[PDB]
Amino acid sequence: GNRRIRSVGEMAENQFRVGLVRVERAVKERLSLGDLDTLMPQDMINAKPI
Amino acid sequence: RGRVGRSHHQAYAWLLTPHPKAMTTDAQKRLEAIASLEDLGAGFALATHD
């Protein structure tokens, strides 16, 4: 009752979220950088941390 | 900072920056570098720091 199965979906989802925290941080940084008027969401998000 | 002043009158300087976390650490440490050393005759000190 106190021990819990953490299977492949949950561990991979946690790792993916741990990655996603980095890329939202970078997006937040560059999005807080201004002149957003001509910008597209391929250079704010970077697939390398994910 | 050099072109303001040049006179008896007090010259205010305004360093508009992004948000302090949003500014990169290079820009940050440059900013408290210039902010820590506001002195008349501090240029060669800044050049030696460069």
Q: In angstroms, rounded to a whole number, what is the distance separating the alpha carbons of residues B28 and A1?
A: 51
Question: Residues of A with CB below 8 A from B18's CB?
Answer: 32-34
Task: Decide: residue A23, CB within 10 A, 0-12 exposed, 13-18 middle, 19+ buried.
Answer: middle
Under 8 Å CB-to-CB from B33, ≥6 apart: which residues? B46, B49
Residue of B nearest to A26 (CA): B22
Residue of A nearest to B22 (CA): A29
B21-44 as b/e, with b when 16 or more CB fall inside 10 Å?
Answer: ebbeeeeeeeeeeeeeeeeeeeee
Question: Residues of A with CB below 8 A from B21's CB?
Answer: 29
Residue among A24, A25, A28, A29 with most chain B CBs within 10 A, to mutate: A29
Is residue B23 within 8 A of residue B35, CB to CB? The reply is: no
Task: Report CA Rg, chain A.
Answer: 16
Across the interface, whether the CB atoms of B18 and A28 are under 8 A apart is answered: no
Tell me the structure's resolution in angstroms, rounded to a single decimal.
3.9
